[PDB]
Each structure stands twice: as structure tokens, then as C-alpha cells.
Design a protein around this ligand. Structure first.
Ligand SMILES: Nc1nc2c(ncn2[C@@H]2O[C@H](COP(=O)(O)OP(=O)(O)NP(=O)(O)O)[C@@H](O)[C@H]2O)c(=O)[nH]1
Ligand SMILES: c1ccc(C(CCNC2CCNCC2)c2ccccc2)cc1
Ligand SMILES: [Mg+2]
Lengths: 468, 167, 166
């Protein structure tokens, strides 16, 4: 076994004890520890665990400041070499070259692995958590200085590499093999953005373009917008702008569906509108856009729309089935949604709401520290639980959709603003009054209303076409 | 076999609302929660000698998904309307939450309780007398809870189950 | 769902990281940034069954050779990569093979031989040469390009199928 430097010159050589580290009941899993012990294990000489690095770098700011983290890993990097053993001493006193067997084993099995892994923490830190440096230019200078003064031929390839990566990052493309399907058009023809609307665009192309849009919004959310539950606090617009942008799109699209429905007062036309939205839902399912699916389900279950019994009576049974099965995904705390998400072949667009609730509750129902023997240990298993969630989010963010963007249709949906200049409550009340108007409460009889659409209402359907 | 009650928690975000359900479902002898597992929102309890199952829907964190509110509320037989006693805005939101529940349930008489929650050691800004007065005008019970000490948590949920039983 | 631990090994510069990132992100990495140790996850349906792939991307540079057994211990299956325009990387394959057998203490370890950079014309290792070596190991040989995506899914999913049958 290797002898370690003295704990008096090198703090990371303290023996493991229940006072500084606790393991969970082929690598160990850490339940809690001091910062020193967490950083030793983050850069352990005995095994590889890159997932520990992602976990740590995602969550460390709740127990350690960035400046302090850098100090600690620089200190971990600076390992004292042992003095010559007795056999070496005797060779040197006879004018011979010592074998230096212990020094060489220590360099090869302790110093080089620990220093490489310190460098790997720096690399991951800069590549995937660069916002620490964007928000603190002095932290970046210390990093650049540290990396740029590492000497020794052993570390050289990675030192040069990390220097280039830092530079690239400071001044901050898809292969498919098969082609995207052809863009589908209906009543609105290419270029005629003025005529674009729920019934005039092709429902296949509506679902596709909304899926591209919602996928891009999903893929833009960073872990920094989630950890510490910052999307719920006062500065959420500062700290979680991508998340909120994503949520607001979902909300706007749901309100647009509701608005399209209750503002169609003629019963026959409203049936065509509801039926077109259920067809869009069906393409959402085909594309694994679960965010899209729940936009539709949320709209059908809203107060203005849910109560329209006369409208739903006229919907084809096959479409009632499609809608009801989509709604069942959300029942029992999303039981069937979760099972379906974990069984499909990506790309997909998850529903983000479940993640937010799990992160918030994990952070709220677990203590920051555990107290053992008078010592305060960082509760690391709480951090690992949060990073399991952000990790799953990132996993579904990797796979891109093989679909062609249509710039005008994308623009039309980006600028959708169903509420206009109205406040939420006022607009919400308006929708419900519209609902009461077009289908009054029992026992008041059902009125008739004039048609408003001058083009045909027949759907082109949701099966794609393919010319040569 | 036993009665299952579907309870829904509603209220402004960002002010400790989720501590309620967590303090209830928890072991309540060790802070060690995993919301990821089914069994983390169901709980068997004895209320006035009658055993029952509580199913709690707490979508804390999702407040910004405001067009999903109707669908979530629709699922519930009773409602906890929660505000923070150190956040006047959350108290002023209560009225619109109650209106939205009545609309979604299509009823003027829906089992609900008003819950004032103390989430930290910051200064109170809603006096309990204001909350009592608001609860009385709605004809519902008012319970104050602490998000740290488990004080009042059982009382809030058990009181809600009594409102359902007596409805 | 079943989880599979895959490890990608081979000499430095042969394209282990480029292959992996092409699989994960459908994106070709043009820069050469030497790996120390990286981890990736992918949910995918293979032969009708949903899998979770854990992929460990390893260091090929000689300076990191002491850390090799550390990642071979955990792996269930190994992608052994060389570049078809680099004879020396092909000769290194033998050493990875033997170390994997040593560590896992077995002659029966799921492996695929991968000859990468098959988009380039200037080939120096012949298919026949690599195929003969693969046969003597009892494993498939697949040529790939991280740049064009040729063979990439085929190499990874073949390794998964072998771990399934193991
Ligand atoms: N033409 C071509 N270039 C490739 C291909 N795969 C990788 N490269 C290039 O070869 C270089 C090395 O790639 P890289 O994936 O980093 O290799 P590595 O095996 O991971 N190196 P290391 O062992 O140090 O981590 C990069 O410049 C990359 O763009 C390929 O299929 N075709
Ligand atoms: C899922 C979501 C919503 C719907 C409704 C119908 C709900 N049915 C109930 C109405 C009240 N009475 C109880 C039944 C709907 C209404 C208009 C158009 C399409 C759908 C059904 C399934
Ligand atoms: Mg690499």
C-alpha cells in the first residue's frame, strides 16, 4: 500500500472517518461529508466516476462559493512528493542513481491520476458551467493563470487543450443521413402569412412547426435556471429566462386553443375547430411532443371549454378516444405519462412541470447539512437527487428532430398573442363569458349563431403525403 | 375499501407552500424526502376514529403554468388555499383562487380551508385577524401553520377532511 | 428499463469522442480536444426494447495509461476503436484486448472492433487485416465515420446486442 503525504502539509490525506465522511448503505456512494472530503472524492486516485463531477459542478454553489472551489482544487493539485527512502539514500551515498521505486509508484498511481482529475474538473467546469466565469471575470483570470502555469510534460496535452477551450468559450450543426419529410400546405399557400390560422394551415405542419419550436425552447434550459429553485423566487426573470420563455409559450398556445374554440359561436363550425385541434394532438403524439399533448389536454379541460357538452356530443368517437387517452396520461400524478416517456424512442419534448415540482420538493424536504458527532456534514445525497433530475432533463435535450423549419409558420406561432393587451384575469373572464353565451347553462335553451368561416372546414387529415 | 379523499393544495408560488404537504406525508422524524416515489403523496390516516386515505395533489413549482390550473383543480374534492403570512400579495391572491375553484367545480359551496403559513422568521405582514375576517366572510375555517416546526399541519388537513365529510 | 454500461477505448486521436458525440447529438466534433474521462446517457429503442445506454468515453493519450483498469472494471461491453489511416492505432488494439481480458478476468467479454475515419481516402489498414483480427477475437468488425454517421449506430447497437446475449 502507498504511503500518503502528512495531513499537516496536505489536508486531503486525512483518514476517512464518520466525522468527515458518510457512505450510503463498484464504487462507494457518498451520503455526506465535509467539503474537503467531497473534493478528495471528486478527484479520487482509485477510480473513475465522471457522473460525480457533473453532480458536483451542478450543485456545489449551495455549500461552497466558486472562488473557494477553485482555491480548493488548486490546493488538491499541489501534492508534495515524498523524500528518498532508505534504499535510495544508500544508493546516493555511493554515487549511484537511486531506484526511486516508491517515488515512482506514488507519481504514477497518486499524483498523476489526482492531477488529471483536477484538470478534468476544470475542463468540465469551463465547458458545461461557464456561467460562473461569465458572472465573475476574476474567477476566470485565476483559472487562466492556474492552467497557464502548470508545468511538466505529463499534463502538457491537457493544459494546452483547456487553454484553447477557455479562449473559444470566451468568444461564444446537425447530421441526419435521412431527409426530413416535405412541408405540407392546406388552404394558406406559402408566403401568404396574412391568411395563416388554425383551420387554414395544414394540421400536420402545425404540429411539426410547434414541435420544432417547443423542442428548441426545451433544449435551451440550463441547470442554472433550476438549482436552488430560482424560477420561483423574486429574480426568476433574471435567473430563469429560458425556462419561463418555454412555460409562457405553452400557456399562450393553450389559451389560443381555448380562444379559437369559444370565439366560434356557430356549433357546426366549433365542432370543426375542436376536431382540428384533436388531430393536431394526434400528430403531437406521433412526434413524442408531450408538451404539445398537454397543451391540448389543458385547453380541453379548462373551464370555458370543458363545459361545452353540445360540442363534444358531435365529435367522432374515434377522436373522443384519442382525447381521453391523452388525458389519462396526467391521471394519478402522471403515472402513464412517466411510463410512456421512459419507453419511447427519442427525440421527444417532455413536459417540464413534473421536473420543477420534483426539484422544488427535493430541495424543500431535505436538510442542507447532517449533524454527526458535533460536526456539520454537507448532505450530498440531496444534491445527487437534484442532479439525477437535471441529468434526465439533459438526456432528452440531446436528440434533435429531423424536420424542416418553415420560417413564416414559425414566425406566426412565435408572435401568437391571444391575450392582446388584456390582463390574464380579464381575458380569462372573457373566455368564460363567451362559453356561457354560446352554450348557456341548463335549463336555458341552446341559441343559434351565424357562421364566420368563408373557406371549407373539411380537414385534409393527419396522414402525410409524398410526391416523387 | 376505505374512503379516499382527493385533496388539492393551491396558492402563490415562492413562499413555502410545499412544506405543508411534505411535513404531512413525511416520516416527520427525519427530513429525508423523495418526491420521485409513488407513496410520497398518499397517506393513510385516522380522523375522528374513521380510517381513510388521503391523496394530495401539490403542484408547487408549476405556478407559471397558469392555464393548467383548471385541469388540476378539477381533480379535487377539497382544497387548501394557502398564503404566506409574510407575503401580502399571496394573501390578496386568495380571492381569485376561490373564484376559480367555484367556477371549475360549478358550485358556491366547495369544501375548502384557508391556510396561513409561516415559512421563515421574517416579519409577519398579514395579521391573523385579517385572515379570520376573510375566512368568516367566505364561510370557511382558517388554520395557521408553521413550515418548520410541523405546527398546525395535521389540523389543516384534518379540518379539510371534516369539511368534506360534513358537506 | 435495462441499463447498459458501454466503454469506448483506443489510441489517442482515433475518434472515440467524435463517434460518441455523433451518436448522442447527431453532431460532428471537428476539434481535437484530448479526453480525460467523459460520461453520456442515451435512451433508445433497440430491436423493439427500450434501453438506457451509459457510455464512458476514455483517454487515449499514453500519459493517462495508468487510469485504464479503473474504467474497464465497470464496463459490460467495449468498443475498441482504431483509425483506418493510422497503422499504429491498429497495432495498439491488441494491448487493449489483453488488458480488458486481464482486468475482467475473462475470455468472454462483449466487444466490437471499430475502424473509424472511413470517410477518408488515404487508408493504411486494410479491411481484410482488421477482419482477420476480429475473427481471431470472436467479435464483429464495423467501419465507421463520425463525420458522415456511416456505421455509427450499427457499431453501438451491435455492442448492446452482444451484451444482451451475454
Ligand atoms: N475525417 C474524420 N475525422 C475524424 C473522424 N473521427 C474523428 N475525427 C477527427 O479526429 C480528431 C480526433 O477526434 P477525437 O474524437 O477527439 O479522438 P479521441 O480518440 O477522442 N482522442 P482522445 O483519446 O485523446 O480523447 C478530431 O479532429 C476529429 O474531428 C472521422 O470519422 N472522420
Ligand atoms: C377530456 C377533456 C375534455 C372533455 C370535454 C367533455 C367533458 N365531458 C364532461 C363534461 C361535463 N359533464 C361531464 C362530462 C369536451 C368538451 C368539448 C369538446 C371536447 C371535449 C372530454 C375529455
Ligand atoms: Mg476523446
Amino acid at each position: 500500500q502507498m504511503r500518503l503525504p502528512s495531513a499537516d502539509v496536505y489536508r486531503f490525506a486525512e483518514p476517512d472517518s464518520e466525522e468527515n465522511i458518510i457512505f450510503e448503505e463498484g464504487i462507494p456512494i457518498i451520503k455526506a461529508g465535509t467539503v474537503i472530503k467531497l473534493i478528495e472524492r471528486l478527484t479520487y486516485h482509485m477510480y473513475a466516476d465522471p457522473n460525480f463531477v457533473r453532480t458536483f459542478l451542478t450543485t456545489y454553489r449551495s455549500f461552497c462559493k466558486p472562488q473557494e472551489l477553485l482555491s480548493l482544487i488548486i490546493e488538491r493539485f499541489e501534492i508534495p512528493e515524498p523524500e528518498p527512502t532508505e534504499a535510495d539514500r544508500i544508493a546516493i551515498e555511493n554515487g549511484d542513481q537511486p531506484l526511486s521505486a516508491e517515488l515512482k509508484r506514488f507519481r504514477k498511481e497518486y499524483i498523476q491520476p489526482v492531477q488529471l482529475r483536477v484538470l478534468n474538473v476544470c475542463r468540465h467546469w469551463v465547458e458545461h458551467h461557464f456561467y460562473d466565469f461569465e458572472r465573475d471575470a476574476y474567477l476566470l483570470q485565476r483559472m487562466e493563470e492556474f492552467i497557464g502555469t502548470v508545468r511538466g510534460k505529463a499534463m502538457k496535452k491537457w493544459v494546452e487543450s483547456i487553454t484553447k477551450i477557455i479562449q473559444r468559450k470566451k468568444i461564444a450543426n446537425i447530421t441526419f443521413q435521412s431527409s426530413p419529410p416535405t412541408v405540407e400546405w392546406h388552404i394558406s399557400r406559402p408566403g401568404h402569412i396574412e391568411t395563416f390560422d388554425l383551420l387554414t394551415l395544414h394540421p400536420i405542419e402545425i404540429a411539426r412547426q410547434l414541435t420544432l419550436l417547443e423542442s428548441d425552447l426545451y433544449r435551451a434550459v440550463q441547470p442554472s435556471e433550476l438549482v436552488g429553485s430560482v424560477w420561483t423566487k423574486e429574480d426568476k426573470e433574471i435567473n430563469s429566462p429560458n425556462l419561463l420563455k418555454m412555460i409562457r409559450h405553452t400557456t399562450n398556445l393553450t389559451l389560443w386553443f381555448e380562444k379559437c374554440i369559444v370565439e366560434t359561436e356557430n356549433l357546426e363550425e366549433r365542432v370543426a375547430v375542436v376536431s382540428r385541434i384533436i388531430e393536431i394532438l394526434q400528430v403531437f403524439q406521433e412526434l413524442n411532443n408531450f408538451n404539445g399533448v398537454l397543451e391540448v389536454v389543458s385547453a380541453m379541460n379548462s373551464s370555458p371549454v370543458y363545459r361545452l357538452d353540445h360540442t363534444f356530443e358531435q365529435i367522432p368517437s374515434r377522436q373522443k378516444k384519442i382525447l381521453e387517452e391523452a388525458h389519462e396520461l396526467s391521471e394519478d400524478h402522471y403515472k402513464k405519462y412517466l411510463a410512456k416517456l421512459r419507453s419511447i424512442n427519442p427525440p421527444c419534448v417532455p413536459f417540464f412541470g413534473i421536473y420543477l415540482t420534483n426539484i422544488l420538493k427535493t430541495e424543500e424536504g431535505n436538510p442542507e447539512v447532517l449533524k454527526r458527532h458535533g460536526k456539520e456534514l454537507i448532505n450530498f445525497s440531496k444534491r445527487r437527487k437534484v442532479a439525477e433530475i437535471t441529468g434526465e432533463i439533459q438526456q432528452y435535450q440531446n436528440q434533435p428532430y429531423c424536420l424542416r423549419v418553415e420560417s413564416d409558420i414559425k414566425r406566426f406561432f412565435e408572435n401568437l398573442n391571444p391575450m392582446g393587451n388584456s390582463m390574464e384575469k380579464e381575458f380569462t373572464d372573457y373566455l368564460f363569458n363567451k362559453s356561457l353565451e354560446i352554450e348557456p347553462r341548463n335549463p336555458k335553451p341552446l341559441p343559434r349563431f351565424p357562421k364566420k368561416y368563408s373557406y371549407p372546414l373539411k380537414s385534409p387529415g393527419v396522414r402525410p403525403s409524398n410526391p416523387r | 375499501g376505505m374512503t379516499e379523499y382527493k385533496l388539492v393544495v393551491v396558492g402563490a408560488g415562492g413562499v413555502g407552500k410545499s412544506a405543508l404537504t411534505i411535513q404531512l406525508i413525511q416520516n416527520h422524524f427525519v427530513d429525508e424526502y423523495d418526491p420521485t416515489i409513488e407513496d410520497s403523496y398518499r397517506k393513510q390516516v385516522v380522523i375522528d376514529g374513521e380510517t381513510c386515505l388521503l391523496d394530495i395533489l401539490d403542484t408547487a413549482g408549476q405556478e407559471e403554468y397558469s392555464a393548467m390550473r383548471d385541469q388540476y383543480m378539477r381533480t379535487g374534492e377539497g382544497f387548501l388555499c394557502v398564503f404566506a403570512i409574510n407575503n401580502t400579495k399571496s394573501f390578496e391572491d386568495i380571492h381569485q383562487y376561490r373564484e376559480q375553484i367555484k367556477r371549475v367545480k360549478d358550485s358556491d359551496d366547495v369544501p375548502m380551508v384557508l391556510v396561513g403559513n409561516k415559512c421563515d422568521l421574517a416579519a409577519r405582514t398579514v395579521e391573523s385577524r385579517q385572515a379570520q375576517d376573510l375566512a368568516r366572510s367566505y364561510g370557511i375555517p382558517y388554520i395557521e401553520t408553521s413550515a418548520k416546526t410541523r405546527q398546525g399541519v395535521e389540523d389543516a388537513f384534518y379540518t379539510l377532511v371534516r369539511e368534506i365529510r360534513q358537506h
